[PDB]
């Protein structure tokens, strides 16, 4: 398995890439973000493991940042795998009510703090959380960095195919993608969990893949 990667996109924004073997898929590549506000660092999704989460935290703490918070974009272990370790270090973990419910229902450790706001500031004017509706999962949400015009679309953005459909809502995904396109068309950069970073068109590609996946199912 390749090592954890940490790449600077620009001032105060880093992409973390972690790797895991998943039954039926082989080696899954997973992207998340670390966002800096002054000397405060926020994790957008945890790596797959406690081990990679610790390495990621140490990399930023060693450079003089303090980890103020982590948010999980949905309940699957590629977003939530580090939550138990973060909870053991009293680093605050956040997830939607629905995500914390789906973590419980599936016998996994919950984020410490749950929210039900559809759209709100994680950090005022720096980090926005938005739920476009069901798609990849019932709970999937996105994170918006207004100052850098970067959207983190998580496992919702699927420009090359929908991946794992087990927890997906094919009926809703196309409407959810249209809602995301109307809200975040001014995006310079879209970071997805499982494909290369791209421009705002990745949201259209996802809509197209969602319509096709719906048609192929019915
Ligand atoms: Na700080
Ligand atoms: Zn997922
Ligand atoms: Zn995923």
Residue numbers in the entry: 4 to 221
What does the paper behind this entry write?
IMP-13, a member of subgroup 2, sharing 92.3% amino acid sequence similarity with IMP-2 and 82.5% with IMP-1, was first identified in the Gram-negative pathogen Pseudomonas aeruginosa from clinical samples in Italy and is a common cause of carbapenem resistance, often involved in large outbreaks. Imipenemases represent one of the major groups of class B1 metallo-β-lactamases found in Gram-negative pathogens, and these enzymes can hydrolyze all bicyclic β-lactam antibiotics. The structural information and dynamics presented here reveal important information about the mechanism of antibiotic binding, as well as a significant role for the active-site-covering loop (L1), indicating that the plasticity of the active-site region is important for the broad substrate recognition spectrum of these enzymes.
In the apo-state crystal structures, two positions for the L1 loop, open and closed, were observed. We define the open conformation to be the loop pointing away from the protein toward the solvent and the closed conformation to be the loop positioned over the active site and pointing toward its rim. The distance between C-α atoms of Trp28 for the open and closed conformations is 8.8 Å.
